[PDB]
């Protein structure tokens, strides 16, 4: 009934119980390393993280190769890439499918959000979802909406003026 | 092509060449009067208009009764509603369909935005689209994203 009922695998194929993120607002993003939007999204995510990580924001990055095969590497290559180019401090999880019958259970839940308004297939790399502290998905954004465009909603969810 | 190559009907069934909005950033929204999102969306659209109308922003509202039949009235009743409760100043166009075989050509075009990334059917009342001064659709937002959440992108498009 909430995002906390789910478990996903980390970059090393180990389970991570999402309930450990209770009390935090989640910015969930499907990522890709070889996309035209890669540099701007990771960079902007870094800015949001630095500014809000200590205020309740957690960013979950899920690699996905279902869009133009722009995330073809292994988990190690993906994490090594981010480690080198972006130095991101938020977690990078195991590669997953976001659409189709093998889509992660987490994403199926995300798509049930807001009366089914979020039912659409993930359109491309870097779609975003925001989950409130109550563990319910409240916002979804098209891949073309860069991370910084979500700051207003992030502040609202973190109750920051 | 671009949004400028389209013609739509205003609240008086009269034609309006959207090319008349060239040079302006456009916030295109499908509206409804009897929805729980109605109040906050109109209120925030008003706020955006007050702040950016003079800076190049134009808000084009398109009524649509395809979602829970929450826009059942006539154009007169709709504009009446809007005026009485929000006194909105942005153009309110003729009621249309956004999905289906009777969908307005405009929305069929908006959905072609960003290499097909904007191809999804309009999810519900109040989905939003941002069009640059050159008539190209550059941003789309889910119904649940309130108007104020688009301010950062609007400012970028207006270069402020």
- Structure determined via: X-ray
> Is there a contact between B142 and A117 if contact means CB atoms under 8 Å apart?
yes
A28 Cα to chain B: minimum distance (Å): 16
Please report residues of B whose CB lies closer than 8 A to that of A47. none
Cβ neighbours of A140 in B, within 8 Å: 142, 144
Q: Are strands A25-31 and A57-63 parallel, antiparallel or unpaired?
A: parallel
A-chain residues within 8 Å CB-CB of B141? 141-142, 145
Record the tokens describing residue B100, joined without a space.
């289906």
Binding-site residues of A = 4, 17, 19, 139, 144, 153
Token pair of A15 as six digits:
């389970």
Q: What is the resolution of this structure in A?
A: 2.0
Contact between residue B156 and residue B132 where contact means Cβ atoms under 8 Å apart: no
Measured CA to CA, the distance from residue A43 to residue A68 in angstroms comes to 21
Nearest CA in chain A to B145: A139
Closest partner CB to B120 (pick from A120, A145, A148): A120
H/E element, B8: strand B7-9
Q: Please name the residue that has the structure tokens 């009621």.
A: B95
Task: Specify whether the backbone of B25 is left (phi greater than 0), alpha (psi in -120 to 50) or beta.
Answer: beta
Residue A4's closest CA among A155, A106, A107, A140? A106
Helix, strand, coil shares of chain A, percent, nearest 5, are 35, 20, 45
Which domains does chain B possess?
1-160 (3.40.30.10)
Residues of B with CB under 8 A from a CB of A: 114, 117-120, 123-124, 138-145, 148-153
Establish how many alpha carbons lie within 13 A of residue A36's alpha carbon, considering only the half-sphere containing its beta carbon.
Answer: 5
CA pair distance A103, A12, nearest whole angstrom = 19
- A45, A90 in Cβ contact below 8 A? yes
Rounded distance between C-alpha atoms, residue B156 and residue B160, angstroms: 6
Long-range residue pairs from B47-56, CB within 8 A, at least 24 positions apart, any chain: B47/B147, B47/B148, B48/B147, B48/B148, B48/B150, B48/B151, B48/B154, B49/B88, B49/B89, B49/B90, B52/B154, B52/B158, B53/B89, B53/B90, B55/B158, B55/B160, B56/B23, B56/B24, B56/B25, B56/B133, B56/B158
Closest CA to A61 of A147, A137, A157: A147
């Amino acid at each position: 009934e909430s995002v906390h009922d789910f478990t996903v695998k980390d970059a090393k194929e180990n389970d991570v119980d999402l309930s450990i993120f209770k009390g935090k607002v989640l910015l969930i993003v499907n990522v890709a390393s070889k996309c035209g939007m890669t540099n701007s999204n990771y960079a902007e995510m870094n800015q949001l993280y630095e500014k809000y990580k200590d205020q309740g924001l957690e960013i979950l990055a899920f690699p996905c190769n279902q869009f133009g095969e722009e995330e073809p590497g292994t988990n190690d290559q993906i994490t090594d890439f981010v480690c080198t180019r972006f130095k991101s401090e938020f977690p990078i999880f195991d590669k997953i499918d976001v659409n189709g019958e093998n889509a992660s259970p987490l994403y199926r839940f995300l798509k049930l959000g807001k009366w089914g308004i979020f039912g659409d297939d993930i359109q491309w790399n870097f779609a975003k979802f925001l989950v409130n502290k109550d563990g319910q998905v409240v916002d979804r954004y098209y891949p073309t909406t860069s991370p910084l465009s979500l700051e207003r909603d992030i502040k609202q969810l973190l109750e920051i003026s």
